[PDB]
């Protein structure tokens, strides 16, 4: 019934990009510097290779002295793991974003887990690529069986110890001369796939 898409499936790519941007467009407080996010198939291959390990833990080669993508020094990563029937790109990314309920923007205090949310709305991250793997078992879950294991990687990586974006009037601190589209800074060069 539920299809787990491959990393080149055009609808899968559209869903990942559109749904990330919708959350980035709609943040509160408004963001002055939120970059428009596009797909990167090299990031999706990286996510594919790591998701294939079926581990609920970060790719060990996201930071120096590794360099998996030739254009980013450090990569970010969000992981979602759950049942095949419940999986969709929309449900997984929304589950990441909804950690906002536990994040206090003013103080950066997180009541539980907030680093999926912060990476979704990380202003400086502008490339994403994702993959979902079918996993008979996922390490780090004992009960789960025959699950969907969905990984997105982000370039450049976010989740530095600072606010995920610069709060301010939308698009008021875009790079260089960038124009604004739905509250996002766009740039023909960055945005090409």
Specify the resolution in Å. Answer: 1.9
Number of domains in the chain: 1
Structure tokens at 127: 């490339």
Structure tokens at 149: 């294991």
* Integer Cα distance of 115 and 100 in angstroms: 9
* Integer Cα distance of 168 and 180 in angstroms: 14
Domain at 32, CATH number: 3.40.33.10
β-pair type (127-135, 38-39): parallel
Residue 80: which H helix or E strand, with range? strand 76-83
* Integer Cα distance of 7 and 129 in angstroms: 8
Q: Which of these, 104, 97, 83, 89, lies nearest to 47 by C-alpha position?
A: 89
Query: Three-state SS for 12?
Result: helix
Whose tokens are 């960055």? That residue is: 190
Instruction: Report, in this order, helix, strand and coil percent for the chain, each rounded to 5.
Output: 25, 20, 50
* Integer Cα distance of 76 and 172 in angstroms: 25
- Which residue range is the domain that position 115 belongs to? 1-193
Contact 29, 159 (CB under 8 A): no
């Amino acid at each position: 019934a539920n299809i787990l898409p491959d990393i080149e499936n055009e609808d899968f790519i559209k869903d990942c990009v559109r749904i990330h941007n919708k959350f980035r467009s709609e943040v509160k407080p408004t963001a002055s510097d939120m970059l428009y996010m596009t797909w990167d198939p090299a990031l999706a291959q990286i996510a594919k290779a790591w998701a294939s390990n079926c581990q609920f833990s970060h790719n060990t080669r996201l930071k120096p002295p590794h360099k998996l993508h030739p254009n980013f020094t450090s990569l970010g990563e969000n992981i979602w793991t759950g049942s095949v029937p419940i999986f969709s790109v929309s449900s997984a990314i929304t589950n990441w974003y909804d950690e906002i309920q536990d994040y206090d923007f003013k103080t950066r205090i997180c009541k539980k887990v907030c680093g999926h949310y912060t990476q979704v709305v990380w202003a400086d991250s502008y490339k994403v690529g994702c993959a979902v793997q079918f996993c008979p078992k996922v390490s780090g879950f004992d009960a789960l069986s025959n699950g969907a294991h969905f990984i997105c990687n982000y370039g450049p990586g976010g989740n530095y110890p600072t606010w995920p974006y610069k709060r301010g009037a939308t698009c008021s601190a875009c790079p260089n001369n960038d124009k604004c589209l739905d509250n996002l800074c766009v740039n023909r060069q960055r945005d090409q796939v």
